[model samples]
Target: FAPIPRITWEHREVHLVQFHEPDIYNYSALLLSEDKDTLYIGAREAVFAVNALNISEKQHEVYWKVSEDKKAKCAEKGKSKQTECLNYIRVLQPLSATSLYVCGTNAFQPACDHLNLTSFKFLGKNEDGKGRCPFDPAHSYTSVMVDGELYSGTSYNFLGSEPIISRNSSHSPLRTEYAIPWLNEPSFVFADVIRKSPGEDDRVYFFFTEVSVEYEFVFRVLIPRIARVCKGDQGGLRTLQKKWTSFLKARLICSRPDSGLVFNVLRDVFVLRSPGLKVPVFYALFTPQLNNVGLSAVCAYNLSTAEEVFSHGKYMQSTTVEQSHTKWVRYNGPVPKPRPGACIDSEARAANYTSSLNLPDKTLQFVKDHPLMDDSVTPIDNRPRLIKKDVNYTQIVVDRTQALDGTVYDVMFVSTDRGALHKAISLEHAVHIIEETQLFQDFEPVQTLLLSSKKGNRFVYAGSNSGVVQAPLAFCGKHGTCEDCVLARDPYCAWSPPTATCVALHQTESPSRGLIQEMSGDASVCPDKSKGSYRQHFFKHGGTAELKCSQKSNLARVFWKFQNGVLKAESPKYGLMGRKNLLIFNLSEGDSGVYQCLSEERVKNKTVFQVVAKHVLEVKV
Candidate 1:
């Protein structure tokens, strides 16, 4: 097997906090505050607010218990009495500065309440949460609060059926049509609101995987999709009243252009907002159904691609004559007035519809019948930017920052199922992995990941079943040398020549100390320094001498360099023992020269060599 590229640093500096109970097993949902200084957690039957800067410091907590009648109903449905019948907090979102919307799976009967931050108590409005929350605690669902409204995608029933994408608010409550063709076994991953312009209406987007309707095969094929709904949509006047009038969906294609193999299962998504770009970029992590082969990939899509496909793409219709085999075909007829499934904006002003409620029935009927677009929205670069073997990327978060050279770079923090985080940067040609750090002591899957950046210092937090682990975006000081730190190509880290220590860019004062390269990954920027001075060692003949080399990275391989050249382990005079040490059984005059212990580590596409220890050996007659 080929060697997997590894960095020379471990996660010794990572901070961790565990939240466990005697009988409880889950602590999964996580939410970050707007200032990035606070984190809200939704665990099994409890909600907690913690200081993001110090995860060990708990600010407040609330316990929500389920009623006995609800527990009995959950047990009648054949669920586990102890594990699955308890109330689990599924959603915790801030509605205003002082109020937070909280929801829980109250023993298969969902319920929601508003919690006052100052008083730390519920407002006593126990409303039914059929569409706003998931009925099953284990189901995949997503919700986001926008403009004092809750937009969610989940199953609305106790039997794991009746999937719905709904907007729950006091103004106008609406949802998708409860039909099989509209949605089939969809697993939602993420939901967010995207604003086009100040005058344009905002749209809510959702990412999910559902059974394919375009294909005709014996077994159902799963397809990843990106669906959107306008915020100003007030349902139709007649044909599709009380339903989403501006709902459209398109296929999200992430594949290998060379092999034509597509990644169909999407796990998570993070939107990266930049200063100059008008639209934010969506970064998604994908894997195959049979992921046992140990494969994972990350794909990035621009907001323009999603909007263009929904605006100009063709529609698909079922055929009548050829109904047995090929059922779906592209529709070539003229489109409806003001374009079907369009938001109420300046473009629709000529159609004489001020809002979605005044739109004609012809447009809403067209949108209800043809929600799926024919053309698929391809990801940026037409392929995955990064792919790896034997690793499943479960969660992703991206940040765009400018380097010293004024060039912008996108940095991605991806978490694996084995509780490890990989820091990667996107270059012009290929993606470079800066380093890999272990986040958990035991091998547990990371359930959620969040990235927070303030004043230039960036940190990533990962939550699992055990607890939460916080780590800096870059381990600059762990590199121990200017060359090693510069070669990492981390945007947040730089090598300071004065102190000769790696430091974060924000911590440095002058530009001379903050020398960073994101695209080049060049180590030549660091000034040259002499290797460690050789220490004299005197030993008698027929005596043993042990040489130790302390390496920072556990993945690096240590090698001994003698005066003659590189020392071979198969030689009779040398015995390499332990992980980072060398021993000589019998010393002789032949080994009376310089001996250097060097560590060789692989960083992305390049191999870096560092001298760990140096010694000068002298043998007595």
Candidate 2:
């Protein structure tokens, strides 16, 4: 079934903190400190550190301008002088406790620098950022600093054609081979390292959408993929020398098998880790390859599922010996002794292959030829967590909150292309969107999203082309009544009887202080509340009267109650106005009584009724 956002909040309806400079734009690069107090923003030719709690307050600012020669050279190469010929900061990661590693598109010549967190300035380290950052401001790239080593997935050339996932370190200059089997024109979205237990090897995973070469079609089909590389891989010794020995990629399935619908293009991914769950879950957003079709999907994958696909899944071979056919299919031949594409582990050590350099040539040949896996990684539920139409979702970040019942709920803060943030909670079969908050004032699309849930400060930071915005995770205090608060189903909210208002769970002194919350679609715990006062309306006989009725939620039904009988549909006497309101074209004494608007919401086989709006119509000659 299709679901819509329960409530939509406008920029004026919600309170948000914004930061922007008239001279700077493209605030898509963002980094939050480990302490979660400072949000370092990377814009065009500039960087600013703002107060994480409130982004409106700017704490520090610096400019990293391009030279005139570089700007002119970029313009000579047919690049925009104002936008493309300027340094657009694209990477902001923590290099150390006191320093930050930052990269920018320096007039089509990518460069990296070090920013001192204390001084809030550059450290004069003008390093080349070819693979660490994209040369074009419009290209897609992602990176993560793992123990001082930078793992980035982006184009390595100035023409912005080559797509490679490289490890830029003071150690080995290791990277993927320049071949179609390794990475076929991939549009990288995210990359991060997964630290395993002491026994297993640490690995880095990259998520992207690439042009498919597996299927034979007239047109190129885009497919979502998840690729992995071992952090301990030191390249092979003989056949696959100087290349990633643990590099393997598999397909990502985010579709409904019941109905032939597939979201093939992956946009963003976020890894959610909680204490209760044994393995981390990867939350990703996908959209269809068709441009006109406006649908977006949110799918989650277990870390073990991805690991299983890479470790035990069947390999797909490209071609045959005779070269008669070039179709890609699963290989039926026996795999190598050390198990190709496996990090050097206990089993490999027992097999006398103690290190990646000691791996046999047969294993290296198998891995280099069969980089693609036959099995695809499916979601946690074998379906999408959320599938919404008419929206182009761009980025996603998940936050797990503990409700009043002590049940940890994973809350998703999904951002759209229109710069809107949707907060939804995954509760049972019905995952309802709590609300939508606009994050951009100019209505520009959101490029990056970060959440600070540490130290009881639950705020989401959105970076867009225009500016950066900071908004709270939950606006529970806006809910007035106990029913509204409980029906919101927000894990961060609870109704307090003594305080007599809805409050955020983290801010409350004690959840034991009579905080009421119903997560399973039940609000009976709320106290009885009075109805709204009726407003008297005067209208002449046989004249049209438009009674206004407001709607706050889309998941509920609004019924216009009449005292005469019941205001039903398909009648010429009364017309159901747009979204709700009663429009009596030719009012008579028959309709001169009381007309009320009641809210009815069905939850868990029970119905909740509340009087939302009421009007007393008086017909006079």
> What value does the lDDT take at residue 555 in candidate 1?
58
* Candidate 1: tens digits of C-alpha lDDT, residues 245-299: 9898888877786764668888888998887988899998888664348778888
Candidate maximizing TM-score: 2
lDDT of 2: 0.86
Q: What digit string (tens of lDDT, one per residue) describes model 2 on residues 308-410? A: 9898989999865345866788888899988889988988888787778889888998999899999999999799998887888899999988898889888
lDDT at residue 34 of model 1 (Cα atoms): 67
TM-scores, all models, native as reference: 0.92, 0.93
Question: Poorest 10 consecutive residues of model 2 by lDDT?
Answer: 564-573
